[PDB]
Write a protein that binds this ligand. Structure first.
Ligand SMILES: CC(=O)N[C@@H]1[C@@H](O)[C@H](O[C@@H]2O[C@H](CO)[C@@H](O)[C@H](O)[C@@H]2O)[C@@H](CO)O[C@H]1O
Ligand SMILES: [Br-]
Length: 448
């Protein structure tokens, strides 16, 4: 009975022992293995894993998937999916296959959740109710400014907009590769061309908007170095940006974890793309000596309702109880409020998850409506080939790192800093080389 070492992003729940104890009860019974989760934290998960990958594990939360897949850091899963992961493979929307297949080979166990999703303003309804601030005209950042002014007056001690050092203005863009290049596909523009986000006149606008937010104090002054969370349960923040999807049932899940009414406002379109498919992938180590077992566990994580909810909702009777009368329905208790559970988006199949009392019958109907009506990005399945430009990438992803954080967070004036970035980029030659190559492959992708 071997021990399976799984690396996970984020902070560990306080009841982790209890969480694995009841989990292993089922896992051992059906697999004969013992899962061990080591959380690695948030802020520097990218670097902390890079050490492990460079320097032995079994399962891991995938950091920069597409890149580390072409290098051979991830084990092949095509044959495992034909046996130990046959069940979970059947429950997967084909778009997950489109997005996580590199060189006719898949290395990921994508968590079946929001395969399509939009970026949203999540509002604190406790602060919305108390001051009656009108969020009816908010369709962008530009329209979010007036609403930030009000909360700054009525509640000076609350952070209006709560963002961090990872913040980039969200738009209707498509990243064939990022991290960490400024190359997008403008889904509101020429869908055939690959462009620079800083040359898109409306994204430059978001930057102006966010610099005004900085100057006005709607944004934490130390935002360029701030990597801190704002627990949704706490009224430290007024509004934040979130990825919201069908497996969340609108603001049902948001209002649940926050233990208060959370209102949401779309700022991007609802679409199926690589980014949405690769948002939460699980991989198995190249050097993993329990590969066949690792898939047998990622299977149980995505196919067993009891096992999954025992981690996502937490212990039964403490954090939740079942609703007698209606099947597949539960209600969270007092035990749920706090670090006593995991997140569903990065643990397993969001569909075998029980549904909480606060989800309306219209919220389930809308999760069926959004699902079926979900449109696909023309670049979905477009995995960029880096064989020719592996080092021309790191030249650009270096010039960016020297400037992008201060810019994307609005700390500096885009009118002065954006030309600095461009000139240093265009002076190189790796810019035009990767730009052309990217356009060249994308042409062949739409040519077919
Ligand atoms: C509230 C909740 O559980 N929401 C999840 C989203 O977080 C998730 O989006 C991701 O969120 C993480 C951390 O905030 C971030 O690192 C990712 O870039 C991504 O934005 C979403 C994914 O479909 O699923 C929701 O349920
Ligand atoms: Br534009």
């Amino acid at each position: 009975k071997p021990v399976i070492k799984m690396y996970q992003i984020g902070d560990k729940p306080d009841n982790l022992d209890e969480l694995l104890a009841n989990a292993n009860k089922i896992i051992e019974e059906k697999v004969g293995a013992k899962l061990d989760i080591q959380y690695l934290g948030w802020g520097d998960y990218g670097k902390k894993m890079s050490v492990i990958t460079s320097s032995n594990y079994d399962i891991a939360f995938a950091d920069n998937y597409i890149v580390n897949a072409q290098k051979g850091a991830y084990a092949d899963l095509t044959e495992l999916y034909k046996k130990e992961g046959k069940d979970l493979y059947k429950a997967l929307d084909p778009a997950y296959i489109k997005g996580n297949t590199v060189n006719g080979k898949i290395y990921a166990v994508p968590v079946a959740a929001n395969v399509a999703s939009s970026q949203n303003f999540a509002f604190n309804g406790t602060l919305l109710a108390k001051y009656g601030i009108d969020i009816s005209g908010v369709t962008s950042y530009e329209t979010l400014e007036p609403v930030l002014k009000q909360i700054k007056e009525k509640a000076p001690d609350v952070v209006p907009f709560a963002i961090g050092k990872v913040f980039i203005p969200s738009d209707n863009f498509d990243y064939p590769v990022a991290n960490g290049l400024p190359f997008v596909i403008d889904l509101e523009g020429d869908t055939t061309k690959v462009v620079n986000r800083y040359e898109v006149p409306r994204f430059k606008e978001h930057l102006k908007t966010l610099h005004k937010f900085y100057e006005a104090g709607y944004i934490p002054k130390d935002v360029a170095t701030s990597d801190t969370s704002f627990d949704l349960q706490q009224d430290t923040w007024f509004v934040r940006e979130e990825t919201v999807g069908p497996a969340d049932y609108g603001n049902s899940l948001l209002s649940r974890v926050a233990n208060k009414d959370i209102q949401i406002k779309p700022i991007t379109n609802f679409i199926k793309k690589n980014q949405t498919t690769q948002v939460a992938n699980f991989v198995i180590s190249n050097n993993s000596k329990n590969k066949e077992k690792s898939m047998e566990i990622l299977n149980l994580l995505n196919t067993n309702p009891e096992l999954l909810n025992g981690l996502v909702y937490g212990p039964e009777g403490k954090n939740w109880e079942k609703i007698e009368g209606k099947e597949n329905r539960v209600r969270v208790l007092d035990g749920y409020k706090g670090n006593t559970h995991m997140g569903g988006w990065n643990t397993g199949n969001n569909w075998i998850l029980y549904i909480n009392e606060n989800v309306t019958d219209q919220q389930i109907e809308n999760s069926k409506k959004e699902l079926a009506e979900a449109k696909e990005s023309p670049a979905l399945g477009f995995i960029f080939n880096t064989d020719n430009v592996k080092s021309e990438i790191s030249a650009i992803a270096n010039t960016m790192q020297q400037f992008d954080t201060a810019i994307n967070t609005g700390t500096v004036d885009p009118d002065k800093a954006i030309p600095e970035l461009m000139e240093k980029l265009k002076s190189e030659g790796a810019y035009e080389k990767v730009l052309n190559e990217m356009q060249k492959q994308y042409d062949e992708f739409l040519k077919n």
